[PDB]
C-alpha cells in the first residue's frame, strides 16, 4: 500500500518528439475515399511528450495533469504497463476512474478509492508453470459508493520476459467531453531500439464510459517482478522489467483525416504545425500545388481591456440623507425623488459602516452595474424589535399600519445603530 520502493529514484521530466501520433476517429461515423476536416482534442504533431522508463534504479510512477485530455504511447516486450489511475484527488474524497489489466480481463470501476503512495499490481513465485497472474492488489485499499462497473472479455496476458528489440507498441487516448469519457486503443508489432518508430497509426474506440467525473491528474501503473530466489521487503524490495511509456497532452486542433477505400486513415495533417498544413486545411486537400494561396487572416490581439468612463461627479447627497440631522416619523415617512445625478454605490455598500444590509430581488453587486428608471428613498426610525417587520409580505404594527413593502419590492433595506 504505502511502502515505498527501495530502488526508486526521481528523474527530470525529459521530453521526446512524436511524428504523427494523436490521430483518432472523432466518432463512429464511417467515411472512405474522402478527406474530412474535424476539430477536437488532439495531440499536435511534432509535439513534446514526457520521456519515462521503468528499470530496476529509476521507477517512474509520476502524477501528471489530465487537463482536458492526454495521449499515451509505450514500447513493450513483456508488457510491463498494467493500467492507470484517474481522478481529481485519486483518493476517497471523490470518485476516481481506474483501468487495470490483471492478467484475466480489463476492469473499469468508479468508486471512492483509498490513495496509495505507489499503487500497482504484480506477481510472485512463478516456477514451473509460467502463469504471471495477478497476485497482490495494491491499487487501492478500499472502495465505496460505486456508480459504475465494466468488464471486458477474458483473455490471457503474457508477461514473460523476452530478449531483443521491442516487439509491441500500445497507444491509448484519454479525453473528457462534457464529462463523457472516450477511450481509444491500437496495437501493432514493431522492431525498435529506442524512442518511438517512424510511421502512422489510427486508434479505435475500446469502451464507452459515460461517467461524468472531473479529473485533473492521473497515474501510470507498472508491473514488477518477484521470485522465490531474490525477494525483498514488503513491498520495497520488488523490481519491474524494462519498459518505456510516454504521455502527451491533447489540444483543440483541427485535422484533415484522409480515408482510404476501406475507411482506414493513412495520413493526417495538423493545420497549426506547418504553413503547408494550413494551406492544405484551407484547400481541404492533402496535396498542395506550386503557387501562392491565401490561407487565413492575421490580426493583432488586444493587450488588455481599457475602460475610460466619464466623471461620476455631481452625486446626489446620499451621505447627507443617511446622516441628516432629523428623520421623519415611521407613519410620516418622507418620499424623496432622486434624479438628475449620478450614484456611487461602492462607498455605501462596501464600507461596512452599517449594522445590517440586505436586498430583495437583486444582489447588491449587480445593482452597481444597472441603470434604473426611478429611485425612491424612504427614511424612518423604528424600534429594534420592529426592524424585522421591514420586508416584503410582512405584518405588524409597522408593516401593516405604518409602512408596507410590496411582495414584488425590488429595493434594498438599510439599518444601523
Amino acid at each position, epitope marked *: 500500500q504505502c511502502v515505498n520502493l527501495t530502488t526508486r529514484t526521481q528523474l527530470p521530466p525529459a521530453y521526446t518528439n512524436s511524428f504523427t501520433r494523436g490521430v483518432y476517429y472523432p466518432d463512429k461515423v464511417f467515411r472512405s475515399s474522402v478527406l474530412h476536416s474535424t476539430q477536437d482534442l488532439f495531440l499536435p504533431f511534432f509535439s513534446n511528450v514526457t520521456w519515462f522508463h521503468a528499470i530496476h534504479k529509476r521507477f517512474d510512477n509520476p502524477v501528471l495533469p489530465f487537463n482536458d485530455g492526454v495521449y499515451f504511447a509505450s514500447t513493450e516486450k513483456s508488457n510491463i504497463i498494467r493500467g492507470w489511475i484517474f481522478g481529481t484527488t485519486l483518493d476517497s474524497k471523490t470518485q476516481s476512474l481506474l483501468i487495470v489489466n490483471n492478467a484475466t480481463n480489463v476492469v473499469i470501476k468508479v468508486c471512492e478509492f483509498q490513495f496509495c503512495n505507489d499503487p500497482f499490481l504484480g506477481v510472485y513465485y512463478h516456477k*514451473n508453470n509460467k502463469s504471471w497472474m495477478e497476485s497482490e492488489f495494491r491499487v487501492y485499499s478500499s472502495a465505496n459508493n460505486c456508480t459504475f462497473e465494466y468488464v471486458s472479455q477474458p483473455f490471457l496476458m503474457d508477461l514473460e520476459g523476452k530478449q531483443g528489440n521491442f516487439k509491441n507498441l500500445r497507444e491509448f487516448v484519454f479525453k473528457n467531453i462534457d464529462g463523457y469519457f472516450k477511450i481509444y486503443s491500437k496495437h501493432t508489432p514493431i522492431n525498435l531500439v529506442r524512442d518511438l518508430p517512424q510511421g502512422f497509426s489510427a486508434l479505435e474506440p475500446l469502451v464507452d464510459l459515460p461517467i461524468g467525473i472531473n479529473i485533473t491528474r492521473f497515474q501510470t501503473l507498472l508491473a514488477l517482478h518477484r521470485s*522465490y530466489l531474490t*525477494p525483498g*521487503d514488503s513491498s520495497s524490495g520488488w523490481t519491474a522489467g524494462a519498459a518505456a511509456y510516454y504521455v502527451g497532452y491533447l489540444q483543440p486542433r483541427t485535422f484533415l483525416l484522409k480515408y482510404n477505400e476501406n475507411g482506414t486513415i493513412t495520413d493526417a495533417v495538423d493545420c497549426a504545425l506547418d504553413p503547408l498544413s494550413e494551406t492544405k486545411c484551407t484547400l481541404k486537400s492533402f496535396t498542395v500545388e506550386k503557387g501562392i494561396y491565401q490561407t487565413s487572416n492575421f490580426r493583432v490581439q488586444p493587450t488588455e481591456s481599457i475602460v475610460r468612463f466619464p466623471n461620476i461627479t455631481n452625486l446626489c447627497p446620499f451621505g447627507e440623507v443617511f446622516n441628516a440631522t432629523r428623520f421623519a416619523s415611521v407613519y410620516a415617512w418622507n418620499r424623496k425623488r432622486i434624479s438628475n445625478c449620478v450614484a456611487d454605490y461602492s462607498v455605501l455598500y462596501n464600507s461596512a459602516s452599517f449594522s445590517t444590509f440586505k436586498c430583495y430581488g437583486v444582489s447588491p453587486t449587480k445593482l452597481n452595474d444597472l441603470c434604473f428608471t426611478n429611485v425612491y428613498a424612504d427614511s424612518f426610525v423604528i424600534r429594534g424589535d420592529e426592524v424585522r417587520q421591514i420586508a416584503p409580505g410582512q405584518t405588524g404594527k409597522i408593516a401593516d399600519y405604518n409602512y408596507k413593502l410590496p411582495d414584488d419590492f425590488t429595493g434594498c433595506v438599510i439599518a444601523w445603530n
Partner: antibody, heavy 119, light 113 residues
C-alpha cells in the same frame, strides 16, 4: 527474538464457530506473510492456507475450501482465523507461522492451539 | 494439489551417527533458475515444528551446522552429520512458493540402545 502467541485451547460444539488469534511480536505484521497448519495424531500435519495482511488475499486447501476465512489486524499485530460449521473431524491442534521477508528463508511457529469439537 | 510420500516412517541413530530422511513429490518443484523450493520442519516433544533447512541447499539461521539437505528432482534426502540427543522429533517436508502448500507424512527419530 521473533515469537508467536496463541490461545491455549478452545472447546466448541458441532455446528458453531471458533475464533483463533496468532499474535505477532518482534516483527511488523504488515510486511510479512502469514500461515496456518493443522496437526492430527494419525494424519500428521495438514495445511490450512496463507494470508498476506498487506494484501489480504487467501488460498485454502481444497479439503477446507469454503469452510474457513482468514483475517488479520494490522493495528493489533495479531492474525485471526475463523472456522464455521464445525464437526467432529475438525478436532486437531492448530499452528500459525509467518515472518517470511517475502522469502522462504525465514519462518517461525507458535506453541500451537488445541481445539476439540464435541457436544 | 500435490502429494508427498516419506520413507522410512522412523529410523534409529546413535549419538554421532548419520540420519537419512527422504521425501518424494508428485510434481517437479525445480524451475528454470536451477534452485529448489522446499523446507524442512522438526517438531520436538512438547514443542511446535521448527524450520531446519530452506531451499534444500541453505541452512536456516541459528540451526546447528550438522543439518543439511541435498538432492535433485522430486527425490531429496536430509543429511545430519552427527545426531545429538536434542534431535528427537518428527521430520517434515514442505513445498512453498505460490501453490496450495502440502505436507509430508512425517519421519520419527530415535537413539539406538
Amino acid at each position: 527474538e521473533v515469537q508467536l502467541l496463541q490461545s491455549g485451547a478452545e472447546l466448541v460444539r458441532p455446528g458453531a464457530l471458533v475464533k483463533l488469534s496468532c499474535k505477532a511480536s518482534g516483527f511488523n505484521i504488515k510486511d510479512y506473510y502469514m500461515h496456518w497448519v493443522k496437526q492430527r495424531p494419525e494424519q500428521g500435519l495438514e495445511w490450512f492456507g496463507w494470508i498476506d495482511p498487506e494484501n489480504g488475499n487467501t488460498i485454502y486447501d481444497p479439503k477446507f475450501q469454503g469452510k474457513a476465512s482468514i483475517t488479520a489486524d494490522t493495528s493489533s499485530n495479531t492474525a485471526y482465523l475463523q472456522l464455521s460449521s464445525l464437526t467432529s473431524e475438525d478436532t486437531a491442534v492448530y499452528y500459525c507461522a509467518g515472518s517470511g521477508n517475502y522469502e522462504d528463508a525465514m519462518d517461525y511457529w507458535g506453541q500451537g492451539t488445541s481445539v476439540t469439537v464435541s457436544s | 494439489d500435490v502429494l508427498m510420500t516419506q520413507t522410512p516412517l522412523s529410523l534409529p541413530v546413535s549419538l554421532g551417527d548419520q540420519a537419512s530422511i527422504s521425501c518424494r513429490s508428485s510434481q517437479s518443484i525445480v524451475h528454470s533458475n536451477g534452485n529448489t523450493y522446499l523446507e524442512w520442519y522438526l517438531q520436538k516433544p512438547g514443542q511446535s515444528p521448527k524450520l531446519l533447512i530452506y531451499k534444500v541447499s541453505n541452512r536456516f539461521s541459528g540451526v546447528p551446522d550438522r543439518f543439511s539437505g541435498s538432492g535433485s528432482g522430486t527425490d531429496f534426502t536430509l543429511k545430519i552429520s552427527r545426531v545429538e540427543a536434542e534431535d528427537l522429533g518428527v521430520y517434515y517436508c514442505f513445498q512453498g512458493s505460490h501453490v496450495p502448500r502440502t505436507f509430508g507424512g512425517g519421519t520419527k527419530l530415535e537413539i539406538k540402545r
